[PDB]
Amino acid sequence: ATITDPRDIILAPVISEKSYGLIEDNVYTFVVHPDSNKTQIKIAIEKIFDVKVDSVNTANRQGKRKRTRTGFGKRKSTKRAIVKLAAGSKPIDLFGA
Amino acid sequence: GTTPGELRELTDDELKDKLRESKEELFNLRFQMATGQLSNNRRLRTVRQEIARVYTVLRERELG
Amino acid sequence: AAVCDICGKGPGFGKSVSHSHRRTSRRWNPNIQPVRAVTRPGGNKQRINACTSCIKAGKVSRA
RNA sequence: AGCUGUCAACCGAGCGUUGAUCCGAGGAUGUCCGAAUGGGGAAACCCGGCACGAGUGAUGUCGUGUCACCAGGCGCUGAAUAUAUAGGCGUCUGGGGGGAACGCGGGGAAGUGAAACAUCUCAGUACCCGUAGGAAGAGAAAACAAAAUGUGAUUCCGUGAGUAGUGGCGAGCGAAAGCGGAGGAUGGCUAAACCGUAUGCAUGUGAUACCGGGUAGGGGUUGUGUGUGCGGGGUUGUGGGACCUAUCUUUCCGGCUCUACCUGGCUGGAGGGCAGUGAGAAAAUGUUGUGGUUAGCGGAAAUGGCUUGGGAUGGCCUGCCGUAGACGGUGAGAGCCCGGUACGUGAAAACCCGACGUCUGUCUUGAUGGUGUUCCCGAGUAGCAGCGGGCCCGUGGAAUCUGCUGUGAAUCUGCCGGGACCACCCGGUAAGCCUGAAUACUUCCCAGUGACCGAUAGCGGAUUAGUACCGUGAGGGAAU
């Protein structure tokens, strides 16, 4: 069958200048499947990376709408999640800068 | 991944064991390719193969 | 004026004619009345819609 | 031996002789909305109960199932109140939506023609509505015909015929009989004129009344009516059937007609039939075709030569095979180059139609022909009065069918049909039920065809197609 595992949720991390403005401040950004929740993502990140996180902030980014001769094109909707680790301050080396 | 000749002659505890390990491998491989460190597809496909057939054999021997 | 519950009688439609013999669609609604007639010999009787023809037939008893 | 679908390439990552990809059969996975059905709702989104498990120091949390409505049976309970009913519970089995046309059954107009227009026609057309099927409805005479010692269920074509007819006798509308054809099965029974049982409802001269010779033991099928339910035995045209009295009767046992003894009348069980998924009883018990289908395999014969030639599939010339000289492409008109065609073959698994061995069901308590005489065979029906429909039939002299409303018959010397109506003769038996075969239709699939179109044509759509776009609508609707 299928069992319940917390790390069936994370899609990817996102790299941006704002993402680095947060990485300097012990706050991280992750790409998360839409049907998730902050509690699930919190438990997932804690279990996978052995770091005790404080709170998680999530946002929905509506897809853009790109021109093409074939017709009206729309990309997929994505959900980004903002996570902030505690004062313990354990960097995630798997982020790869 | 493994031959049906072995799979059908092996027992309940062992397909439970490969069930848990295959869920664990689905977990790992799907999310290294999610992180972007992984490249190819056939791994998710063959672990899908394993989970599908083990669940099929589970209900088969449960009914029979 | 719709249907009596036993013989299944529904209203038919026809045309009225004048002395000048002009057609016009009209309606015939069957004679049905709400009456409460005995079903079992103990004397109990329940309100059902029965047409006058059925009542004359006596398919429901009187007491 | 190649492969990772396309626009659409391009990279990169790789899989295969252990046979990857590709095509077929079966199986599972199958988010959410949508009959949507745990409840709600602005469709793809919000909110819970119940049982079993994971995790925390507990909670929070996380997975798996279950929870709509209606109808029809089963069990419990029984309110106003006592019997008893509604309602209330628990569990199974069914239905809900979609589909191009075909069909049955109800509803149902106008533009038009009559050179106007009301009868009429347009027309039971369009459209709306509720049904199931692969076809449906109809279907065994209460049908025709007219003296022939005739046809013989239903269905669908060609005739009969634009004829007899109907029609402000105008516009117009329009048969039937008979004949020739397609297809066959003139086919089995239920239910009231006796009885056994589950019965009750009632009583009792509770004893000489009940069993089919003789002797003997014993102790309400109400006496009489009404109404319903349950059953052997009567479903008919020369017109037909039993409450009782006359003739041959192809096994046997028991219990009965309130009892035991020859005669007369019914029911249960052993063995020839009749058949059966049938429409005349219904549920079950298990079986082979190179029939087909969803898919594949083999499948002949010139690198021929020379020339225009970019390239020949072209021109000429030899010799090509052919049970295959259909069709496309390859640098130009190719059966000799390939895709392939005649012809053979071929399926592990699955599905629809066609035979062959446990088991099931019925009766041989029955059957065949023979001489007189005393409640049943379909009811609020046939028919009648009025009011309307549909057969050509538009109240005309108007039969036949149906319906609304009132009345209302017999059970055979009874009826209605035989185109307002009847005396004598002539042909069929109404109110109950179903039944294959010929027919119509094609959303879908396969194989083909075309003196059908070749981009303003052909479906609106050979291409982002019911897309863009317009309209908030039902919708309209492109060009390329």
Next chain:
RNA sequence: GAGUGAGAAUGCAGGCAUGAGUAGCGAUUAGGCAAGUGAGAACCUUGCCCGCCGAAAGACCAAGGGUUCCUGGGCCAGGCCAGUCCGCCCAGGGUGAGUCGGGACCUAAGGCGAGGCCGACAGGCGUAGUCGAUGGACAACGGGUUGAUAUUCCCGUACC
């Protein structure tokens, strides 16, 4: 055998002319100059004056639209002109809530509706209920931030 012969039907669809380089270039506020980028500068960028609104022509919200927001690239197509510019087009980035707005709370007008009533049929009503805010119950500020986001992020202090 014909969808078989066009010059017209204020014909149909496509294309192209003159009127013609003619009118107009969308207000009651108005600019000019310098330096800078650029191949090209009144129109873009930066500096100084002038002009106009200032119960707006400023700053926020709801309904509505959905990426027009910011950054980088380019100016055949669009902006009634050229345009380095743009709400042009290409790529990337950007929306952080127990306390702000709705659901887990409840109702008005009104909608749906088990049973039920009526209705040939399709249906129409409305009871128990369930929906339905434009309403009611229930929990914040100052400052700071980069090139775009702030009562959301951070600092400081609290609430229910």
Next chain:
RNA sequence: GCGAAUUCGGUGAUCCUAUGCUGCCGAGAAAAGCCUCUAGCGAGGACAUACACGGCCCGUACCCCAAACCAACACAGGUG
């Protein structure tokens, strides 16, 4: 990066007390929450506090009296 002073007075609302008071007639919603009372239970609940903990989903950019909404336009119009 550093960082001074941070008071008096007066004017003053259409804002708050105010869902108030006074007067008029044309006489001014509903339910949830909240407080309390009992019916039907019951052998362990009631009030404070040190402590670690657990609080769902969705909107959140931009425009918004306009060249971004409705007017076919980057429109002298309309929009709470």
